């Protein structure tokens, strides 16, 4: 127990992972060596605590989007978001479910009686609203 890492190591690990994600890897004994030259760390204990947290954070990064930024994950996001645009829209459906109450609204706006509109049967019962209070 008592193995909590403080701001001094966590912020440094996040910064060096952001700057040198490509060079860094899954090996603790190699991350401790790259930490020799990517930053000036006054103490060996501080440097290997930082290296251990770096390896832990890289294990987290290889699976998920940790708050520490990464250019590969950033460009993958910037791809997914602007892409997977479907070849056919979800808004060009041939038939559209239209309530008769909603149907009269289009009549005033004189855009009703379209082919894609299908006048359904409105629900009967008015059974909405949850039972009040407990039970």
């Amino acid at each position: 127990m008592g193995r909590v890492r403080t701001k001094t190591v966590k912020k440094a690990a996040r910064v060096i992972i952001e700057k040198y994600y490509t060079r860094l890897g899954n090996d603790f004994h190699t991350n401790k060596r790259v930490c020799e030259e990517i930053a000036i760390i006054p103490s060996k204990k501080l440097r290997n605590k930082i290296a251990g947290y770096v390896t832990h954070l890289m294990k987290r990064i290889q699976r998920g989007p940790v708050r520490g930024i990464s250019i590969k994950l950033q460009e993958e996001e910037r791809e997914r978001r602007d892409n997977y645009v479907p070849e056919v829209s979800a808004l060009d459906q041939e038939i559209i479910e239209v309530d008769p109450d909603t149907k009269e609204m289009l009549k005033l706006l004189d855009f009703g009686s379209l082919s894609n509109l299908q006048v359904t049967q409105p629900t009967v019962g008015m059974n909405f609203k949850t039972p009040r209070g407990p039970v």
């Binding site: 060096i16 006054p42 103490s43 501080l46």
Partner: protein
């Protein structure tokens, strides 16, 4: 720490000055703060071009 003798008694003066860090070691100390981590800034070094080979 310095004592000052006034007609009412003695005034004690304590002055602490945190020296600035400097590699020259003249205006202050040379070692950095133990918890201060300075990360050097790399260059771009992207190199997205096709694989070529310089001949020299």
């Amino acid at each position: 720490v310095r004592h000052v003798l006034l007609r009412q008694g003695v005034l004690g003066i304590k002055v602490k000055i945190m020296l600035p860090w400097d590699p020259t070691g003249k205006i202050g100390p040379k070692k950095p703060l133990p918890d201060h981590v300075s990360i050097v800034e790399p260059k771009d070094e992207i190199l997205p071009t096709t694989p070529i080979s310089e001949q020299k």
